[PDB]
Amino acid sequence: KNSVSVDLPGSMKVLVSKSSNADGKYDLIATVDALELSGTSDKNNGSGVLEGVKADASKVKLTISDDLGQTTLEVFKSDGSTLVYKYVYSKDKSYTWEYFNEKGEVSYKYIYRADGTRLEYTGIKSDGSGKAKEVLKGYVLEGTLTAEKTTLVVKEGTVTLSKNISKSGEVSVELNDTDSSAATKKTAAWNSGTSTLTITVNSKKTKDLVFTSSNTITVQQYDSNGTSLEGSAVEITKLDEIKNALK
């Protein structure tokens, strides 16, 4: 065979001709779950566009970025005008699936992060609102979506912890406690550089909750004066431990 195989970031395979044709372009072939796609490219690294048509006449397009770092697989209605499905691998980043309704609006989105943690958005409406779930190792956080941000909520007693994720992926966390007693009301402050929520009760720092770049949470207590950390930070592995930290 006059082709060579390329195993892309994200593990889709594309066959590229060893040499170019009279137009200087290379032939591309790929098989995506049993359907063969074909195209040509002015590069020979596996980048470019491939197309095919499903048995039901849906149009399929595979687009591989010039640096190989991004793979997009799109399925459209039979006239090619409206998306039905879009998968994107973003190298060392995430696998994302979008499903679209008949107007070509996203109705469902699932993000599988490189670290194995996930985000799922359901019942997405025209104003960009919806329901949100984050799937971490050991526990699930539930919340909501707006056009501004995702807000995941954990409640314990009179305390509500809100983990916000901006449209750019930036995490910030807020805490509100309806308790009005100085002895027991939790309040918190957020350090955006270290992604740390420091909780204070009765004028004394009690705990730091760190929201790590690995999409885990750690908790560490302060001493009885609130003026030094004590022990060592402990990675949370269950929902009960988040709730315990909010007591």
UniProtKB/Swiss-Prot annotation:
Q: Which family does it belong to?
A: Belongs to the OspA lipoprotein family.
- Annotated source species: Borreliella burgdorferi (strain ATCC 35210 / DSM 4680 / CIP 102532 / B31)
- Give the protein's biological function: Induces host (human and mouse) cytokine release by monocyte cell lines via TLR2 and CD14; nonlipidated protein does not stimulate host cells.
Its gene is: ospA
Chief place of localization: membrane
The effect of E170A is: In strain: CA8 and 21343WI
Indicate what this protein is called per its UniProt record. Outer surface protein A
Q: What lineage, starting at the top, does this entry show? A: Bacteria, Pseudomonadati, Spirochaetota, Spirochaetia, Spirochaetales
Q: What is the effect of changing K13N?
A: In strain: PBre and 21343WI
Q: Where is it located?
A: Cell outer membrane; Cell surface
